[PDB]
Amino acid sequence: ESADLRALAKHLYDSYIKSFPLTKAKARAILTGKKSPFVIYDMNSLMMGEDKIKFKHITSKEVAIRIFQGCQFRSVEAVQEITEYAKSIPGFVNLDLNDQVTLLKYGVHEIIYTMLASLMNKDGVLISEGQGFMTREFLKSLRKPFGDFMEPKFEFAVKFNALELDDSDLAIFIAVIILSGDRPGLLNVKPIEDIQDNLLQALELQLKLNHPESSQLFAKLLQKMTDLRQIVTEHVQLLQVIKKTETDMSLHPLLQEIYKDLY
């Protein structure tokens, strides 16, 4: 069944390439300088970059709020990209429909953090499919709670990126996250865990073949699900403080509805 695991790994890689706009491979070529992105490093260059490149989401007039809501808007797009990718995981569309919704509902946050790291290095983050690069220092220096809402994402990404996974690795890793049998309210846990057992076998063989000199990389990656659960839990607490504190966060009620599951 070694061949079946390789076929499963290739199936997921192919679908991961079609589902997501900017791959890690393309993102790293930009970040290392190997088509030069527009750089946002302070207030003036943000103004010029939105007026020349037109990063979509500009509809509150305060910069720190507007960037915060830009993160929320792009996360909404990623949820749909993740949902389409999930449909391509063998067995997923055969699950009970409520369980498919539950798995996506409780998984998207962990997957967004994971895939955000592909776009980050220690100095900043690629935006608009890599047309722009917004610096870490600019994000971290935004006022009041917003600066400290940004920085934990880089702190995780820098640690996660030290594993040096590529797209073929991440495609299986993301699928493993989705097929988590311990999500609250699942109705039929067994077929979810059966599929996850398949994905874990495929991820294990993938990492051994793709990183034969990286001892226990499989274990180290699974240990990163501890970082993922903990930071998603921190994330929820930070959002709640911003909601109860900030009276300048009003969008059209329709927009608020679109965003309901990330605010």
The torsion region of residue 26 among left (phi > 0), alpha (psi -120 to 50) and beta comes to alpha
Binder among 183, 204, 251, 258 for a second copy (CB under 8 A): 204
Q: Is 95 in the site for ligand A1IPZ (CB under 6 A)?
A: no
- Closer to a second copy by CB, 133 or 160: give it: 160
Q: Is 229 in the site for a second copy (CB under 8 A)?
A: yes
- Binding segment (CB under 8 A) for a second copy, from list 23-31, 67-75, 116-124, 227-235: 227-235
Which two tokens mark 248? Answer: 């300048």
Binding of a second copy by 201 (CB under 8 A): yes
150: partner contacted, choices ligand A1IPZ, a second copy, none (Cβ within 5-8 A by kind): ligand A1IPZ
Cα-trace Rg, the chain:
19
Please identify, using beta-carbon distances, which residue of 168 and 196 lies nearer to a second copy. 196
Quick one: which of 219, 240, 243, 248 contacts a second copy (CB under 8 A)? 219
Is residue 235 annotated as involved in ligand binding? yes
Contacts 24+ apart (CB under 8 A), 39-43: 39/132, 39/133, 39/134, 39/135, 40/127, 40/132, 40/133, 40/134, 40/135, 40/138, 41/134, 41/135, 41/137, 41/138, 42/138
Q: Choose, by CB under 6 A, the member of 71, 82, 89, 192 that binds ligand A1IPZ.
A: 71
CB of 87 to a second copy, least distance (A): 24
Q: Residue 246: name its binding partner from ligand A1IPZ, a second copy, none (Cβ under 5 to 8 Å by kind).
A: none
Question: Alpha-carbon distance 175 to 86, whole Å?
Answer: 7
30 binds ligand A1IPZ (CB under 6 A): no
- In sequence order, what are the residues at sequence separation of 6 or more whose Cβ sits closer than 8 angstroms to the Cβ of residue 115? 20, 78, 170, 174
Q: How far apart are CA 39 and CA 124, in angstroms?
A: 10
Q: Where are the beta strands (DSSP E) in 38-80?
A: 38-40
Q: Where on the chain is the footprint of a second copy (CB under 8 A)?
A: 182, 196-197, 200-201, 204, 215-216, 218-219, 222-223, 225-227, 229-230, 233
